[PDB]
């Protein structure tokens, strides 16, 4: 039931007080209405009803899904989820905002309003039903057949026994992705790459690295990737919708622990190879502490001197995580 081909739209059946799901696709898809008992979820405890025409519009999470393998709510009775919700849509799409309110007696009303102004007669409709003891729930929907710049603005619903809650409608262009890097970690740390983005419509995302591309678990939405497998390199996140694209390059590195086991010396010249992100080198009567000044100057390795006097000499790698060394003889 993924959002493939043209996403579902809504239309109120002219005959009765009920909604109809119009999802476009080539081959026609499976149109199923799903009403959840709580705010959430897809867990098999809620109610799925494949009918294309829904009559029981009262309920917590109502959403229509188009499948075939090719509803914005304001609860005055409930606490606000976010500070001033934003509803984005492309010009031409149908706006649908359902306002629900629960009161003890039926003595209460619900009203929709724009920026301090009344709503059009063919842009509103209200339903009502009874709950628990003698409770009354009311749904006052507002709808736009085809949106335009004219219809963009702050919509609010107020009740004659409830606090006025609002939401702003943003309706411009045909598709956007708004999202705001190099990293390095020690071989022991648990890390996840992250990307926060506010984008519409629902984007198709892909986390690719070297050639191996893996999909993602997508106010804003945050996509994550944790199967790094401590493998270093460029992890590129490419996300795109119908009228917009995006790509973010993430560099990754490992701990600066130096391996100095690669000792080597040609006759009359010597050096050591250091496998560490940040190497820094150091070259008889003294107990292996006297520093040899040297003649020459010093994932990747690093390299040192030319012979003057023959003896055993130690050479060290230095990094954020201390030191490591190896000793070579200056003979031939």
């Amino acid at each position: 039931l993924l959002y493939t081909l043209r996403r579902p739209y809504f239309r109120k059946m002219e005959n009765q007080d009920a909604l109809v799901c119009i999802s476009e696709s080539v081959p026609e898809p499976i149109v199923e209405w799903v009403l959840c008992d709580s705010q959430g979820e897809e867990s098999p405890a809620v109610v799925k009803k494949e009918e294309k025409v829904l009559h029981e519009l009262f309920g917590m999470d109502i959403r229509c899904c188009a499948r075939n393998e090719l509803l914005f709510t304001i609860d005055l009775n409930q606490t606000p989820q976010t500070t001033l919700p934003q509803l984005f849509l492309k010009v031409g799409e149908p706006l649908w905002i359902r306002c629900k309110a629960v009161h003890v007696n039926h003595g209460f009303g619900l009203t929709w309003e724009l920026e301090n102004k009344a709503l059009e007669e063919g842009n509103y409709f209200e339903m009502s039903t009874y709950s628990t003891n003698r409770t009354m729930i009311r749904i006052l929907f507002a709808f736009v057949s085809s949106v335009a710049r004219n219809d963009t603005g702050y919509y609010t619903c107020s009740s004659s026994k409830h606090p006025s809650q609002s939401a702003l409608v943003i309706i411009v262009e045909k598709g956007f992705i708004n999202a705001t890097e190099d990293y390095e970690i020690d071989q022991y740390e648990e890390f996840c790459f992250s990307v926060r983005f506010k984008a519409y419509p629902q984007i198709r995302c892909t986390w690719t690295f070297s050639r191996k591309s893996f999909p993602c678990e997508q106010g804003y939405s945050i996509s994550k990737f944790c199967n790094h497998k401590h493998q270093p390199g460029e992890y590129i996140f490419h996300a795109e919708n119908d009228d917009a694209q995006f790509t973010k390059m993430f560099t990754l590195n490992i701990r600066r622990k130096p391996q100095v086991l690669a000792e080597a010396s040609a006759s009359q010249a010597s050096c050591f190879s250091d496998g560490y992100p940040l190497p820094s080198w150091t070259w008889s009567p003294n107990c292996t502490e006297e520093i040899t000044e040297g003649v020459w100057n010093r994932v990747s390795s690093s390299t040192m001197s030319e012979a003057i006097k023959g003896f055993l000499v130690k050479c060290c790698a230095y990094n954020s995580l201390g030191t490591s060394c190896e000793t070579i003889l200056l003979n031939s």
Binding site: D17, H106, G107, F108, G109, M127, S128, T129, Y130, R134, M136, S160
Partner: protein, 145 residues
């Protein structure tokens, strides 16, 4: 008088609904009750209610409401819930001080299926007017003669 309004000397009769008390899914609660009822159970309907284009349906709903309460007293554990659920659909009539039936009011025995059917039709016809009309004169039920 049990403490009348101190502003208007010519009485203070009030009965109107600012917001519609009739729910949109009332026909469902009646069909659900009817599914567990024996259709020929004897109830009553007023036989001589005065012809009054404004109070008519309202008077009969008040009477039908009075029957929902009487039925709850003789109903089984589960039947009580179905009756109460239909009682809530028409309970709003008690928000108004409807006077007790007059001595002239005569009742005729009818099937509970008939009572439920006419209650449904009365709610349907009353739905577009419940908030636009003043029902203050309906508080006194009137007889034909």
């Amino acid at each position: 008088s049990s403490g009348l309004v101190p502003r208007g000397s010519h009485m203070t009769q009030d009965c109107s609904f600012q917001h519609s008390p009739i729910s949109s899914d009332f026909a469902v609660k009646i069909r659900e009750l009817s599914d567990y009822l024996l259709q020929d159970y004897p109830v009553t309907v007023a036989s001589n209610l005065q012809d009054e284009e404004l109070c008519g349906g309202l008077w009969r709903l008040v009477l039908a409401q009075r029957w929902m309460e009487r039925l709850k007293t003789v109903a089984g554990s589960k039947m009580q819930g179905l009756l109460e659920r239909v009682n809530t659909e028409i309970h709003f009539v008690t928000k108004c001080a409807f006077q007790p039936p007059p001595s002239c009011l005569r009742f005729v025995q009818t099937n509970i299926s008939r009572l439920l059917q006419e209650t449904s039709e009365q709610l349907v016809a009353l739905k577009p007017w419940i908030t636009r009309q003043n029902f203050s004169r309906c508080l006194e039920l009137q007889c034909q003669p």
